[PDB]
Symmetry: C2
Subunit: 106 residues, 2 copies
């Protein structure tokens, strides 16, 4: 019944655009609590050369409560990652994001 | 003063290798508590095409205290990232790692 904050990736949107994430984001995903915390831009510029200081960034994390070992939460993380992906696609077009599934091979 | 959890990246090593991270890693970096938690592979493959399930992954986090807004921690975030990279360079070659600054979108 232990907790483990799994990093899912980042979400962002222009600082000029007002967005109420508490009304837009679900409380949980795949039965795991979904958390979003504001942080500095995780990199200076985007792929197109535009600056990131014009956007507000949020770390997305899933609070999982379990006892089994991490090398067994793979099912949850997968269901969650898919669910999260579909949640983000439902947000206003100006919202951007980078999720684990977007990472290049390590 | 609020405790902000800043995702730093990942660290990993062969699963068959019983390393003692508590003995290998420092307790803090740039005055902030360094946390590491075992999690599922963030991606299925390494750049060379080998599967990630052969390694045990750890999510790296820095617990930063600040009485200023989380979004203004970039100066400290950058100093911590530099210090953390140096720390990781000192670990055995069997340990792999990638910090936020190298994390790119496919």
């Amino acid at each position: 019944m232990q907790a483990v904050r799994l990093f899912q990736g980042y979400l962002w949107h222009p600082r000029a655009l007002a967005l109420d994430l508490k009304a837009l984001l679900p409380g949980e995903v795949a039965g795991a609590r979904l958390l979003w915390d504001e942080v500095p831009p995780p990199t200076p510029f985007f792929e197109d050369g535009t600056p990131t200081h014009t956007q507000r960034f949020y770390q997305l994390t899933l609070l999982v409560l379990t006892e089994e070992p991490p090398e067994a939460l793979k099912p949850l993380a997968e269901e969650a990652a898919e669910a999260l992906g579909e949640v983000l696609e439902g947000l206003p077009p100006e919202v951007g994001w980078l999720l684990l599934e977007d990472l290049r091979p390590l």
